Amino acid sequence: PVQQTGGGNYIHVPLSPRTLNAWVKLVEDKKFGAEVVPGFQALSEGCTPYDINQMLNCVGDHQAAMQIIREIINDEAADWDAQHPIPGPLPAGQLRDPRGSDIAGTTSTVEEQIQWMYRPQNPVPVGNIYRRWIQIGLQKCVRMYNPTNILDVKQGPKEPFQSYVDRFYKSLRAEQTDPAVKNWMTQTLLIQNANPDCKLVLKGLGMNPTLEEMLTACQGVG
Amino acid sequence: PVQQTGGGNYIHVPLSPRTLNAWVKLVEDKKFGAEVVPGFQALSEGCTPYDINQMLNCVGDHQAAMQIIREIINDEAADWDAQHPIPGPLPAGQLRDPRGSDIAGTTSTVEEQIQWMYRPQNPVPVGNIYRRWIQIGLQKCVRMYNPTNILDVKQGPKEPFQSYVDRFYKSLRAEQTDPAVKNWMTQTLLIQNANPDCKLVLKGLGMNPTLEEMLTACQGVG
Amino acid sequence: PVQQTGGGNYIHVPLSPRTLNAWVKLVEDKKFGAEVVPGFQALSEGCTPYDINQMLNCVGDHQAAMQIIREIINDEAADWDAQHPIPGPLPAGQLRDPRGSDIAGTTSTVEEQIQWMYRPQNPVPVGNIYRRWIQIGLQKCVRMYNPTNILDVKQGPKEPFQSYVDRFYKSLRAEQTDPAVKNWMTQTLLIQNANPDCKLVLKGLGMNPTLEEMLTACQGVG
Amino acid sequence: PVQQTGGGNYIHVPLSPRTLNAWVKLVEDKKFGAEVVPGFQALSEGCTPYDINQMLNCVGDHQAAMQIIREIINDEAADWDAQHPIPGPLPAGQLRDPRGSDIAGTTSTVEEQIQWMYRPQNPVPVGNIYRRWIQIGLQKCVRMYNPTNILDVKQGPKEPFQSYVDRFYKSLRAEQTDPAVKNWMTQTLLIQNANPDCKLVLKGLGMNPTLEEMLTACQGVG
Amino acid sequence: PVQQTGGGNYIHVPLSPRTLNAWVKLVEDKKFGAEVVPGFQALSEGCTPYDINQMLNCVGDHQAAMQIIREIINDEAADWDAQHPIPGPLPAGQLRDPRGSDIAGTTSTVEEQIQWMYRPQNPVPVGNIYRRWIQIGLQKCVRMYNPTNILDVKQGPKEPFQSYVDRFYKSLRAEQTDPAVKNWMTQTLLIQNANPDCKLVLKGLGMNPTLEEMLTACQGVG
Numbered sequence A, B, C, D, E: 001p002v003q004q005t006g007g008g009n010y011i012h013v014p015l016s017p018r019t020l021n022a023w024v025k026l027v028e029d030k031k032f033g034a035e036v037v038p039g040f041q042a043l044s045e046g047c048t049p050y051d052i053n054q055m056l057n058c059v060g061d062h063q064a065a066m067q068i069i070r071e072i073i074n075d076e077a078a079d080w081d082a083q084h085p086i087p088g089p090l091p092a093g094q095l096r097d098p099r100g101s102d103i104a105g106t107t108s109t110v111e112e113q114i115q116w117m118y119r120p121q122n123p124v125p126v127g128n129i130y131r132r133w134i135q136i137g138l139q140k141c142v143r144m145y146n147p148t149n150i151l152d153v154k155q156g157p158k159e160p161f162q163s164y165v166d167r168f169y170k171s172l173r174a175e176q177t178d179p180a181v182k183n184w185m186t187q188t189l190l191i192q193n194a195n196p197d198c199k200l201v202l203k204g205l206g207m208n209p210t211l212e213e214m215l216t217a218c219q220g221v222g
Ligand SMILES: O=P(O)(O)O[C@H]1[C@H](OP(=O)(O)O)[C@@H](OP(=O)(O)O)[C@H](OP(=O)(O)O)[C@@H](OP(=O)(O)O)[C@H]1OP(=O)(O)O
Pocket: A016, A017, A018, A019, B016, B017, B018, B019, C016, C017, C018, C019, D016, D017, D018, D019, E016, E018
């Protein structure tokens, strides 16, 4: 992470040990579940890429998942290099402009990453960009491991609409798909894969029922 | 959040990462349960709107619930604007008076939010007002998801009064209803939806029995 | 809470957010169980009444229990007022002597509460006194909710003495009763409500057996 | 605990509230289990006797166990007094030499305890000595409450050697006995109280098999 | 651990108590499981060998495992001594060069360990080297205690590929074996020890199927 000192200067305040342990506990227990994506974002707020690489290193034991994340980072960096090409030869006496691998923290030191993070002329947020690249790698793992496709998800005959909705949405989240497919699924596949007892009522509600009105009406129905 | 420095000046001390992770853990596990409302209030004490927006952003994945909360904030702000209209043209060289969206932190920076929070002439508590608007959005979600209406709640024949009371009140909390309906329900629906074995005794207690005397008398009855 | 600065001066360092969340978690999960009493004492060490009122406010949703605690505080304060009556008219230029509601923090500010807490002439520990008043309110709730009276508690025929002792004592704790009734119960009701197989041995031990010798002798008996 | 200031001086930094809550949670849940002994040691590192007495006070509700611990402290102090008798009349203008109850923190203030802890001429570690006395009291409670003697511990016919070893050692730990009895038990009672299917193999291993070779060989056997 | 002061000087900031408690909780609950290896690495980041010895001391009660770790440290140190032999007689007025046991922290003080950790001429990372030696001792314990060999691991007939893969990999991790044996096992033993229903499909996928394509294809198959 980064701390400030009198005069407008900046320094490094390393990610703490019990914050890294928590990241490890969220990954080991939830096994790269959907919640692994947000837990990471928060435990990484105010931190720099070097420390994001330490967090991943502590969980490096997982290798199928860390292979997927590593692949993504290399790609995004290449695109950064393509759309932000070397401006030209570098005038000396200054810090080079950030390249794709520096955002990652593999070829670059934390101080250079902090100088960009707090560069008066044009500060580059090296820290937030890398977290996002890593979050696409974590999200793909969730979809890879997701145990149930949404089409299979259904309601126990005596099971209620709320728990079924909870399970149906859990999967829709991990199955990123697209937001429009989600709208069709949330307004139809929920009613279609439901049992008939609460469907009659989900149909009575009307057309384009909202979830607030689908849950209120089916409370106790079955 | 906000920190003070020598001379009476103020600065920003960002909400910490493991406090945001906890907010995420309370939402992911309890699934916008009733306890999500208080956990938030406490994890947000001493914090400013910008940081309240970060907490919500980490849990932004939940979208049906964050749609309900977002709707409420826009409304309250409009009412703030209606009852606290623009005083007139703004004399220059000073900070504008707070508008509805500034309390939210969408159109306004933290420093302006802190200057109001600690404005010597008329300090506006931008931070506490927004938390309350958000808490009405969270509370509506609890009632939307509540799995059981109180009328259905009853006592297992061999189940005791204490657990039944615990389940009956859990729902009464989430079903905000009104405090008077609560008094009628707490003094009648509890006895009526109970089994007859402990009801005989709940009737022996007398009229307007208090809970302290309804629980003491039915300890072991059944 | 209270912090000290160069010169012998004192200031306020508010109870932290994740300490308040823990108090909320202990109350929501244990449901005003016996452990709620000590958790509170510890999370309130070094804190002042204002902050004790914030902790209770976060859990204010619980109302039957907060009605019992509120009743007790008003009483103790009245007794404080009765045995520590207004000394007389107050010489001006100084802080008034503490009244019953100031100990609570309802009519008084934290600074006045801290000035008494650290008054050189006669410092009044406003903070510890209020916590105790609140702990009597919390303890009454535990006894109100206690699910099992000790007389009913018995040993499963195949159940051991240790678990039965654990359950028997759990209730004796919550059923404050008096320490002497406890001695009679701990030396008799334990043996009497036990099964006969381990009682024969609890009788062989001798008269006035101690728990250390009642548990050692019945390890494996049944 | 103890903090240092410019000039070589020392002060008191009280044990924090959420560290005391954890000690309470480890005692309430594990019920003076074996792990209560180490949890305490760690939560007490850098702390002084006064703060060790606060930790015990928060859990003072438990009284059979706190009676056993209290008895031990009085004894050890008496032995300290016997082998470290009053040197003679005390020259004035200095701090007295530590007595048995001062190590406990009952008759002595924290500052005196810190002056000894950091006495240039002959610093007495009042803090660590008392923790050890308390740990003998906690360890006796574990053995008092231990639910199963090792001789009874055996292997389910379909149960594996690893879980049986885990249960057999759990008890051997709490049953301090002596290290030699432990060696005889760990090399024999484990094989003798095992089922015959894995014993044949535990015998094939050879004589004086080590645990590393008893567990590797019986992995899958049964 | 180590802190820095004005002038470029360094000091010691001891490992905190609740960080040591967590290490104890991870060892007591997971019982020297695979996750014990990473939890340790993180809770030890920024710490020095003396503090790594305190963490191990708190869990010293476990003795079969601490015998395995202790054996390894002695060996690695001997190899350090062999490949980094005494340079010769030591010029006086300086700190000796680090020996094998100093890296451990048994014969050496923290200040000397910190002077090497931050030696301008040739800083020796005494802290990280010892953690690695300890991690080989912890990893051997995991393999010793591992309850299931991978060959036995199979898929319940109605069990899915994902959970079976999770269990199969859990063991492959703890059974360090070699990375090549892992590739053969991950591409064959998974399919071979699977049930026939999902194997038909795992065979349809093609030759050298990747896990991402073995999990996607068998989602719902069985
Ligand atoms: O606020 P956090 O980001 O969670 O950091 C906490 C916080 O210390 P700070 O207030 O200085 O940030 C804790 O205090 P509380 O917020 O709970 O009041 C403190 O715990 P203690 O008060 O018990 O000391 C703990 O410090 P530590 O882990 O050394 O005990 C430290 O956690 P981090 O060191 O990981 O930042």
